[PDB]
Structure 1
Amino acid sequence: STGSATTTPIDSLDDAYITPVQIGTPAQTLNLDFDTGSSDLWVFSSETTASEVDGQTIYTPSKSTTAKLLSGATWSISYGDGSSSSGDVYTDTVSVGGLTVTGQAVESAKKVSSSFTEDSTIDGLLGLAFSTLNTVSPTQQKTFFDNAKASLDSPVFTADLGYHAPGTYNFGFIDTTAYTGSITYTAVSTKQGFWEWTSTGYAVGSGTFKSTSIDGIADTGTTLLYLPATVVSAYWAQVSGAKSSSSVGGYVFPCSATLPSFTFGVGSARIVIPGDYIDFGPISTGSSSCFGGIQSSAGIGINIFGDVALKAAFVVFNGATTPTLGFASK
């Protein structure tokens, strides 16, 4: 089997991407944030505190003839930005782009924090990191990908995120028309439950490539690119007027600037992030100070290749017995 679904930026800055997901019988379609940095499939639901729902589409398991309460199971997650949610668990039929999993754990939110309530366009998350990070207790549950794997033509999924445009998540096959050149595969450590890999270096604009190992995670659920302070300083030094602002919480730059590209290494290959991808617009409405798309990971504790980086590539998440990651230009 295979599946293929279109993923769409939620706003004009590509802050996140939503992908339609069918849950239950009859289908209830929710627009989920596919997140390769987490491993819970959780949704706004009929059980969510009313005051904490603000425009989202909800999953109502009582209306699904295939939903079953997973007795005694709860979940609770806190992401790396202060946001949180928690609730109970059902199993139900979940389909993504024609690919169906029966018995998928669907985590129903009883509580969500303001940060999630405020994103009216995101009806929940579909985690695609390793199932070892799944928060369901007392019996940890598998991700949609983990559940689908055995049935897929090939045990892979791919992320093809667009810049200010729709893109595609495919399951079970590699669309050889979706990228240019070849796919360079690189080793993954699953020891922290992430798609954790090591970049071979970077370049800023037309600058010379610096060979240096940068460990990080491929995370579709993070907007920006978080890299070591040395790397980030080297980048923003090439932008006249750029500075790190403690009040704003990162590097800002004059909105009148044209940004240089940023290149990261994948083995001997190179992925180029165009400068425009690194512009996240005014810090506040009407401001001429703009927020940078490359930020320091210092104090996060991990480097994160988020959407800024991933949308410059066709990315293969290979869940073979020994998982690997593949990157191609596009």
Structure 2
Amino acid sequence: STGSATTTPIDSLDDAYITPVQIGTPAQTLNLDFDTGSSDLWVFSSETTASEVDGQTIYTPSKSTTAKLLSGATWSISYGDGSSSSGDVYTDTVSVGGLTVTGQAVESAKKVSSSFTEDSTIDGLLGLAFSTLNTVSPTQQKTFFDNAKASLDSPVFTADLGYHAPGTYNFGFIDTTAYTGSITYTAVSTKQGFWEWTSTGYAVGSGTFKSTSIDGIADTGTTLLYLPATVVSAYWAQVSGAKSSSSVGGYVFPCSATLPSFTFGVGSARIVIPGDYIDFGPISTGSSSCFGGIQSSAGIGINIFGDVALKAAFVVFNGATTPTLGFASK
């Protein structure tokens, strides 16, 4: 089997992407944030505290003839941005782009933090990291991809995120019309539960490539590109007026600037992020100070290849017995 679904930016900055997902019988369609950096499929629901729902579409398990309470199971998750959610668990039928999994754990939110409430466009998350990070207790649950894997034509999914435009998540096949050149594959460590790999270096604009190993994660659920302080300083030093602002919480630059591109290495190959992709717009409405799309990871503890980086490529998440990542230009 295969699946194919369109993924759409939630706003004009590409802050996140939503993909429609069918849950239950009859289908309830919710728009979920596919997140290769976490491993829980959780949804706003009829159980979510009413004051914490503001415009989201909810899953109502009592209206699904295939929903079953997973007795005793609870979940609770906290993300790198300080947001969180928690609740109980049902199993139900879940379909993405024509690919159907029965018995998928659907984590029903009883509580969500303010940032989720405030984002009416995101009805929940669909985690695509390794199932060892799933938070369900006392019996850890499998991701949608893990449950679908055996049925797929090939044990893979691909992320093709758009710049200010729709893109695609495919399951079970490589669309060879969706990229240019060849796909370069690179080793993955699953030891932290992430799609964790080592970039071979970087360049700023037309500058020379610096060979240096950068360990990080491919994370569709993170907006920006977080890299070591040395790398980020070298980038922003090429932008007149750019500075790190403790009050704003990162590098900012004049909105009148034209930004240089940023290149990262995948083996001997190179992925170029156009400068425009690094502009995240005014820090506040109407400001002439703009927020940078490349930020320091020094306070995180891990480097993060988020959407800024991934949307410059066609990305293969290869869930074979030994997992690997593939990157192609597009």
Q: Same fold (TM over 0.5)?
A: yes
1:5-34 Cα deviation digits (max 9, x unpaired): 000000000000000000000000000000
Aligned partners of 2:139, 2:320: CA distance in 1, in Å? 24
SS class of match (2:38):
coil
Where does structure 1 differ by over 3 angstroms across 4 or more consecutive aligned residues?
none
For 1:85 and 1:320, how far apart are their aligned partners in 2? 31
Once residues 61 and 133 of structure 1 are traced to their aligned partners in structure 2, the CA distance between those partners, rounded to angstroms, is: 25
CA apart distance, 1:161: 0.0
Q: In the TM superposition, what whole-angstrom CA distance separates every residue of 1:232-255 from its partner, at most 9, and x where no partner exists? A: 000000000000000000000000
Q: Provide the C-alpha distance between the structure 2 equivalents of 1:81 and 1:299, rounded to a whole number of angstroms.
A: 12
Superposed, 1:56-95 pairs within 5 Å as 56-95=56-95
Is 1:306 the equivalent of 2:306? yes
Cα distance, 1:199 vs structure 2: 0.1
Q: RMSD of the alignment, in Å?
A: 0.2
Report the Cα distance in structure 1 between the residues aligned to 2:15 and 2:112, rounded to whole angstroms.
Answer: 19
1:207-232 Cα shifts (integer Å, max 9, x gaps): 00000000000000000000000000
Matches of 1:195 and 1:241 in 2, distance apart? 35
Distance 1:307 1:83 in 2: 18
1:81 CA displacement: 1.0
SS of the residue aligned with 2:150?
helix
Which residue of structure 1 lines up, in the alignment, with residue 16 of structure 2?
Answer: 16
Partner deviation per Cα, 1:258-299 (whole Å, 9 max, x = no partner): 000000000000000000000000000000000000000001
Q: Which residue of 2 aligns with 1:294?
A: 294
Counterpart-to-counterpart distance in 1, 2:321 and 2:299: 33
Separation in 2 of the partners of 1:114 and 1:75?
A: 18
Following superposition, the deviation at residue 195 of structure 1 comes to 0.0
Partner-residue secondary structure (3-state), 1:189: coil
Per the alignment, in what secondary structure is the counterpart of residue 20 of structure 2?
strand
Deviations 1:167-186 (A, max 9, x none): 00000000000000000000
Equivalent position of 2:3 in the other structure:
3
Deviations along 1:91-132, one digit per CA (max 9) or x if unpaired, are 000000000000000000000000100110000000000000
Shift of 1:308: 0.1
SS at match of 1:72: strand
Counterpart CA distance in 2 for 1:128 and 1:82 is 20
**1:281 aligned counterpart, secondary structure:** strand
Count of residues paired in the alignment: 330
Q: Distance in 2 between matches of 1:293 and 1:104?
A: 35
CA distance in 2: counterparts of 1:160 and 1:211, whole angstroms? 27
| SS of structure 2 residue aligned to 1:116 | helix
C-alpha displacement of 1:90: 0.2
Distance 2:69 2:119 in 1: 27
Q: TM-score, normalised by structure 2?
A: 1.00
Distance 2:119 2:187 in 1: 34
Query: What is the SS of the residue equivalent to 2:277?
Result: helix
For residues 302 and 180 of structure 1, the distance between their equivalents in structure 2, rounded to whole angstroms, comes to 30
Q: Residue 264 of structure 1 aligns to a residue in which SS?
A: strand
Partner of residue 212, structure 2: 212
Counterparts of 1:155 and 1:260, CA distance in 2 = 37
Percentage of matched positions with identical amino acids: 100
Residue 281 of structure 2 is matched in structure 1 by 281
Q: SS of the counterpart of 1:162? A: coil
Segments of structure 2 that go 5 or more residues without pairing to the other structure are none
Alignment match, 1:167:
167
Cα deviation for residue 205 of structure 1 reads 0.2
- Describe the SS at the equivalent of 1:309: helix
Which structure 1 residue ranges, 5 or more long, are not aligned?
none
Output the TM-score relative to the length of structure 1.
Answer: 1.00
